[model samples]
Target: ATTYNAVVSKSSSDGKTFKTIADAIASAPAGSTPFVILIKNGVYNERLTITRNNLHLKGESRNGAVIAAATAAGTLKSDGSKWGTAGSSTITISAKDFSAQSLTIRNDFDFPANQAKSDSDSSKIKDTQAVALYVTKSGDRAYFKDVSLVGYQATLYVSGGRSFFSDCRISGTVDFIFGDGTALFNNCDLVSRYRADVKSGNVSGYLTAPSTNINQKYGLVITNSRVIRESDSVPAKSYGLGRPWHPTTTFSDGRYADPNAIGQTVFLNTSMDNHIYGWDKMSGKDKNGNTIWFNPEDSRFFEYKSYGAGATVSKDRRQLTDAQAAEYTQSKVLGDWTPTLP
Candidate 1:
């Protein structure tokens, strides 16, 4: 029961408030007191680009309040060009001290209608990288609690900055939680969903595709979380933990893996479903257009004290040493600011 500076509802009968969430955001000033916008229960079917710093978006209910869009990476736009992955995001936040809680941000881009079921299926909408949220480099110290980001592909794109997600549900297909930011997800649910492209028994999808910069030590770190499948029907040992991504990076002469995108991910005290498996193998091209395989051993992926049906004692899974585990704390991972844990 917190107070908000502004209120948004779809119905104009509410009175004395903005009709849309974006309108309230646009009315709020950048540098000021904590501008909290309370959204009522309704489906906001519009795209939002939040740039105002220190803005707090609070929803009446996590399930009742919804922000939704249906734009894909290849969705036709009025500009005569397709919306790229970064541009296709339902909500793009590029500011500092931003926080969203008790709401659902969703990108309902129809993958089954747009994507081919199998190699033999002849669906033409090829580019299907739709994102629910895109937090840009400047959106530092961003925090999310009790929120759900829903999409099929490239769901929550953390472009950069230090962010924290607490008790949130982020679900998607391939590279659903892809990003290069130093994000620490605590007590969160990473749900790998069913994909239209992949068959029932085959490998389902990948959780992350980090393009972390060489300088950043922590890319995507999850602690005290659960990596589960969307349903029981999803096959066992089908979904992967993550894969390294260079984000169309230049490999000097384009020979080896991109030096900048030295992807780093760690899962500490995680409970996972049997569907989770090995870190995926990535491919890059050489100077002479030769295929180069970058295995899981190349990236910085470590798991600590993970226990579940999916937990593996296999040497393929990397474990953090006792000394390393001591340093992997919420305070240590987040650098300076420790978030208000949900």
Candidate 2:
């Protein structure tokens, strides 16, 4: 028999249930036992931060149990730096040995509709940076299954740790799935949503902007997944599979290109839409105001046996041989732990 430490419900017959997720988390003893929190079917409109280690959040249903919030980049604090990346998250998980299943975590910040028609006119685009889920500070094992992350600009931020996402759906427009974590996405859906008006011509948006550490052996490895565009009208050769997030730290005040973010993204046995560009350049100005382009080849961006309309042999995309592909298994990615759904 599985024993849950706490139960969260919108309405429960027994009076012992907690109304909020935070409340239930607070009542549970910190770092005592690897406890489970059973969340019933409901739309939990709250910003949650899981700091305690060895906790599992189990939702009744993937579609039914929803944890949502609407914070954005422009959502300023008293400090005035804006929420930026980590702060503008619907759910921020900071605990180690953390796993969540069967739920939707969303940051409902509309970027395309809210931003200016032209990329040059960025002065009007308010609150564009929003993250659905930010796994900020977990160590070595953060697992998520049957989860859906929805947003526009920055949907899922796997900032730290070795994470595994299985049977998940993540949707966004620009740099949607990104971060500096060693992540493996298995049997997941990478949805590139329709952007009605984009300032940058030819490029619709990028699927990933991985700021992987230079030392990390693996960055974002996607296997047996589907990268689907929302609309056929978006045109072919509109979006790139990914681009390295090498921003000029000194020039942009450390805003865009994180010097630490040496991106590494690999696609293995995944289906892609025609809209995806093999690879793209990260165009920006250096500290000296000179145009600097970061090459995808310099970073660890590669693919292996990617069969679809979007997959192609170009100078931008490097194909890994069968021998190289053998090294990138789930066991290698997740270390000793193999996650199974309950």
Candidate 3:
């Protein structure tokens, strides 16, 4: 167990211990022991990544532990720099058994930086595309509790592995929590803060864009999840639940770069808002534009006892039977991998 208070401090008066956070983890590659890094919180305005194995990043308290930066928008840049992609994610977790409890990870993209140039070139400040937190390629035994990810499109991408998010608050716009991992979000709160025209007709912002591959059996499963559009400022109150994110090579357009966005999201016994687009014409349609929806038997779209404005069943909506839903209970979702989440 390593205490960061002695190694790092929030005071500007403090020495280079500020650099210790990233340097320490990067230097020591965990071998036999799991390095538990306990962060004593104030506001850690740092862009860091964890590459070691069996490393645990923990916070003292939910409100007290804050990892913030700015600018919650931007795609990954090609220059091999972390600044462009995902808006400078507050922290990038690429290790295993990474658990974050009672902490607030953020990116401070809301402020404008000063520059000697004109307004157009004057820092292009918000262009920084700051990010809050990003978890990738590793998810076995990953536990996150009481974690708050705040950003307008600030995202939590689960690229691979298995993870469990319990009682965590994730806020963002444009499919904020989309990724290609087998993650189970139980009792977590989702808030949308999208206020941009980036998403036009046919294309919509979703909360979960599961990128489960054909070889992967499980995708993203959300049970007892809550959606809150409490912020009145966010427009396009109506939104789609999610889209599949996989290589579309099964049919004719096999090599096309289009993402797999259908028949992969399963919202079980969850609540929805009037803004949710349970089914839309964008899913998949025949030449005439009318969709010949894929049967669940053929596809894997499943939902059970979902109650909400968007949970309603219609010609467009695809839902699972109560019995079928029973087969997808929480226990079934996490079979052989249940953790003690108290």
- lDDT score of residue 147 within candidate 2: 92
lDDT, candidate 1, equals 0.85
Off by over 4 Å in 3: 1-20, 23-29, 71-88, 110-131, 194-204, 235-237, 247-255, 258-263, 280-301, 340-342
Per-residue alpha-carbon lDDT of candidate 1 for residues 97-210, written as tens digits (9 for 90 to 100): 889999999999888666655666554567889999999988988999999999988999997788999999999888898889988899999998876567767777888888
Which numbered prediction scores highest in lDDT against the true structure? Answer: 1
Report the C-alpha displacement of residue 127, candidate 1, in angstroms.
1.3
For each candidate, give its TM-score against the true structure.
Answer: 0.93, 0.90, 0.74
Residue-wise C-alpha lDDT for candidate 3, range 161-277, written one tens digit per residue: 777888898876555666667777889888865444444443335676555665666667878988766465444436666655432335564343333433366878788776666
Clashing pairs in 2: 247-257
lDDT of 2 by residue, 146-244 (tens): 999899888988877888999999998888888888889999999888777764466778888887878877889999999998877776888888888
Q: Model 1 misses residue 321 by how many Å?
A: 2.0
Q: Give the best candidate by TM-score.
A: 1
Between candidates 1 and 3, the lDDT winner: 1
The global C-alpha lDDT for each of the candidates, from Candidate 1 onward, is: 0.85, 0.83, 0.62
Clashes of each: 0, 1, 22
